[PDB]
């Protein structure tokens, strides 16, 4: 309802932004993820893989590799990275290498999912979301980006369906 009124603006094909203001825990359960540099892929794994464990992220990194070989050359955010495909893959696959919005875009296409990354301010509230894919918040795989450096998984609270 609040969640049904989100206003997404498609800024570039397949990528949308929204600036609602809410307390994350009013609408979502946070499913905390470990770091060791892998928390982006752990968060994806939590929401896409049945029986997820602390090893599941390796599967998501392989799908990211597959995705990159199809999509990396044409990803707008890849222009920021500025690496050849092969150098990009070498870095991405490195142990503890951070994931990002670039991998979210490629994974949304590879996995056939919508990924939303909600970013939180120092005041604790969500101030913006970036969405990769056309699905709504109820269909999407929702991630929480915090401390400018960490991803956790989110699940919508049951009373909002």
């Amino acid at each position: 309802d609040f969640l049904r009124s989100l206003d997404w603006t498609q800024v570039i094909a397949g990528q949308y932004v929204s600036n609602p203001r809410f307390n994350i825990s009013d609408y979502f359960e946070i499913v905390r993820q470990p770091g060791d540099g892998n928390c982006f892929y752990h968060s994806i794994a939590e929401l896409t893989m049945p029986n997820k464990t602390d090893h599941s992220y390796h599967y998501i990194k392989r799908l990211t590799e597959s995705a990159a070989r199809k999509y990396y050359q044409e990803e707008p955010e890849a222009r920021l990275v500025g690496l050849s495909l092969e150098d990009y893959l070498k870095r991405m696959l490195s142990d503890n290498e951070w994931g990002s919005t670039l991998e979210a875009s490629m994974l949304a296409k590879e996995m056939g999912i919508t990924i939303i990354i909600w970013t939180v301010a120092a005041s604790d509230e969500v101030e913006a979301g970036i969405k990769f894919g056309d699905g709504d918040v109820f269909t999407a795989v929702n991630l929480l980006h915090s401390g400018q450096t960490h991803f956790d998984a989110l699940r919508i609270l049951p009373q909002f369906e």
Partner: protein, 75 residues
């Protein structure tokens, strides 16, 4: 000349620029005004992401045009 930039939080800021400014220069100005690191910034105009080494002029970005700023988020 003044242009506008709508940030990821939906704040629309003014920026002082020259038509000859590269996108890299514009990112530095946003850093100076808003504190956003240049490596995070993706600037978008007319549904296309702008390239670092091109100028506002290269893109037909005029006085009072509005750019969208989207962030590269890592973790």
């Amino acid at each position: 000349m003044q242009i506008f930039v709508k940030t990821l939080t939906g704040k629309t800021i003014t920026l002082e620029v020259e038509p000859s400014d590269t996108i890299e220069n514009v990112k530095a100005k946003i850093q100076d005004k808003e504190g956003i690191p240049p490596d995070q910034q993706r600037l978008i105009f007319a549904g296309k992401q702008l390239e670092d080494g091109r100028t506002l002029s290269d893109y037909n970005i005029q006085k009072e045009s509005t750019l969208h700023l989207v962030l590269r988020l890592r973790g």
